[PDB]
Design an enzyme around this catalytic site. Sequence first.
Site, PDB file in Angstrom:
ATOM      1  CG  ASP A 150      -1.946   1.105   1.244  1.00 33.29           C
ATOM      2  OD1 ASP A 150      -1.793   2.085   0.490  1.00 33.29           O
ATOM      3  OD2 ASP A 150      -2.968   0.949   1.943  1.00 33.29           O
TER       4      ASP A 150
ATOM      5  CG  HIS B 137      -5.182   2.208  -0.605  1.00 36.95           C
ATOM      6  ND1 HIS B 137      -5.016   2.313   0.724  1.00 36.95           N
ATOM      7  CD2 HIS B 137      -6.276   3.013  -0.933  1.00 36.95           C
ATOM      8  CE1 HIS B 137      -5.965   3.138   1.230  1.00 36.95           C
ATOM      9  NE2 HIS B 137      -6.717   3.581   0.209  1.00 36.95           N
TER      10      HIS B 137
END
Length: 233
Positions: free
Chosen positions: A171, A202
């Site tokens: 992420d 993400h």
Amino acid sequence: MLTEGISIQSYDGHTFGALVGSPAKAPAPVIVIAHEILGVNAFMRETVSWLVDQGYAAVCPDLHARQAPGTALDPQDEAQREQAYKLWQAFDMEAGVGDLEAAIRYARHLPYSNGKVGLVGYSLGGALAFLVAAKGCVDRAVGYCGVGLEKQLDKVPEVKHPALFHMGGQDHFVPAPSRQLITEGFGANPLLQVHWYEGAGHSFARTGSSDYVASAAALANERTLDFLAPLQS
């Protein structure tokens, strides 16, 4: 999309709508869902339906109502992503927590409530889920892919009920040093769990996202349901 006529009033008289899924059978615990920066959209509809299928009632409040009522943006459209980023930049987190606390109070009083309320947040909602867990309004909280958790570590010892966090290992919002800070900080409080999903970005649990990873989403979601199950009668 919101359910017509639903209105929840917050600490300051602000009211807002919500998409509500009544449970398959009464009574049931109620899950308040804190949405992404995109509002109450197709992924929220899917999430309500999923939790209802899993033995919950669900309430997804319209958190952007202080800015613009009924925000429901489709992440496939550049223009709609742009409007979401503008809304996020302006979003009042403290007022968000207040609205979520009002939704939780609303959830507790629903006629089919078994007296237990959980909260599940995604993206924007994942960061809000941590802040609500620190306030202690909910029986259990879950946050997927929350941004900026490394800046809220002072709140770790405020958490007095269980909370579970799912975080992508790739992420870009949570680079290596931030992941280290979160891991060490959250680890001090055994009421918290933070799981990292190696190789996942993400939006790894959002159906339709180019970040979606079925294996990771599956594991996170299984953990979420097992963590919420103790709320069921």
